[PDB]
Amino acid sequence: MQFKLILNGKTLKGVITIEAVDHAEAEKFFKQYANDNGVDGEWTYDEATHTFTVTE
Ligand code: NA
Ligand SMILES: [Zn+2]
């Protein structure tokens, strides 16, 4: 399945899309991406479009 993260950072904007075998793995990956990049924001998830957003 495809999933998307929209990053609405203070000085970094982004869109990333992944291929993930299940919903848990996509969640886990975007968790780890958050820890790895020091992302501190408010999160949403839209199941209809498989879209996470994070807004710093
Ligand atoms: Na930023
Ligand atoms: Zn789904």
Number of Cβ within 10 Å of residue 5's Cβ equals 21
Q: The CATH number of the domain where 26 resides is what? A: 3.10.20.10
Q: Which ligand is nearest to the CA of 47?
A: 2
Return the structure tokens found at 29. Answer: 């990956």
First to last CA, the chain: 27
How many domains, the chain? 1
Q: Rounded to the nearest whole angstrom, what is the distance from the C-alpha of residue 56 to the centroid of ligand 1?
A: 7
Distance 17 CA to ligand 2 centre (A): 14
Cα 18 to middle of ligand 2, angstroms: 13
* Residue 6 exposure: Cα atoms within 13 Å on the Cβ side: 12
> In Å, what resolution does this model reach?
1.9
Q: Which domain holds residue 48?
A: 1-56
- Main-chain dihedrals φ then ψ at residue 42, nearest 5 degrees: -90, 135
Q: Give the C-alpha distances (Å, rounded to integers) separating 35 from 38, 47, 48, 49.
A: 5, 22, 25, 24
